[PDB]
C-alpha cells in the first residue's frame, strides 16, 4: 504494498525535456491516500541529491541518516509530475509527520494556494 502519502520511492522520470528534473531518482508521494489506493497513477515531487541545502521556499531539505538516502538531499516542490505506478521501483522510506507538514506548506506556496 500500500502506497501512503509521504512515502519515498525510487522512480524512473525519464525521459524529460529542457530543465525538467529527469532520470531515475527518489520521489515523495504527495497525492492523497485515496488516489494512492485506487488510481493507476500517483502524484510525486522529485528529490535531488545534487544539492545539500537550499534557500528556496519550494525546497525542503532531508537528512541522509534519518531518511536513509544516498546523501543529504532536497525535495523539489516545483518539480512535480503524475507518474503511472509502473514507474515506481523500490521503496526507500517515508517522511515523518513534521517533515510532511513542511512539505504541505511548501506545496501551498509552490501553487500559490496561501
Amino acid at each position, epitope marked *: *504494498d*500500500p502506497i501512503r502519502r509521504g512515502d519515498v520511492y525510487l522512480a524512473d522520470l525519464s525521459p524529460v525535456q529542457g530543465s525538467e528534473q529527469g532520470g531515475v531518482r527518489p520521489v515523495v508521494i504527495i497525492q492523497n491516500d485515496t488516489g494512492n*489506493k485506487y488510481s493507476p497513477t500517483v502524484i510525486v515531487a522529485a528529490i535531488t541529491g545534487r544539492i545539500n541545502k537550499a534557500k528556496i521556499p519550494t525546497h525542503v531539505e532531508i537528512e541522509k541518516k534519518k531518511y536513509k538516502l544516498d546523501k543529504d538531499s532536497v525535495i523539489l516542490l516545483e518539480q512535480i509530475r503524475t507518474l503511472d505506478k509502473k514507474r515506481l521501483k523500490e521503496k526507500l522510506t*517515508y517522511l*515523518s*509527520d513534521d517533515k510532511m507538514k513542511e512539505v504541505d506548506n511548501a506545496l501551498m506556496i509552490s501553487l500559490g494556494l496561501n
Partner: nanobody
Amino acid sequence: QLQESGGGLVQPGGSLRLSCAASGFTFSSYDMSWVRQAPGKGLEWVSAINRGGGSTYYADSVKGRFTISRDNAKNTVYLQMNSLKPEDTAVYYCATWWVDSYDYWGQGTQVTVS
C-alpha cells in the same frame, strides 16, 4: 500475521496494555485500529492511529480513558486502557485500516473488568 497479547482480568479502575504484533507484511504502510466485540454484541470501533503515529482517534465510549500508540521499529501497536469499567469487558481485536476498509484481522484477546 497479527497476534494480540496482554488481555486479562482486572478489577474496575485498573489498567491494562493490549498489544498487537504484525508480521508477513510491511507494517509501515497501514493505519491501525482497535475494535472490540462483547458477547452477543456487534463490533464496536474503539481507536485508531495513522501510519506515522502523529494522529490518533478514539470512540466516544473510551475517549479520554484509553490511549493508542505505535512502535514502528517493533512493528507493534499498543492500547493503554485506564479507568476501566465493567462495560469495557469484551474481546479486543487489532485491525488494519487502509483508506476505508479493514484488511487483516488479529486473533482476539479477552478483557474482563469485575
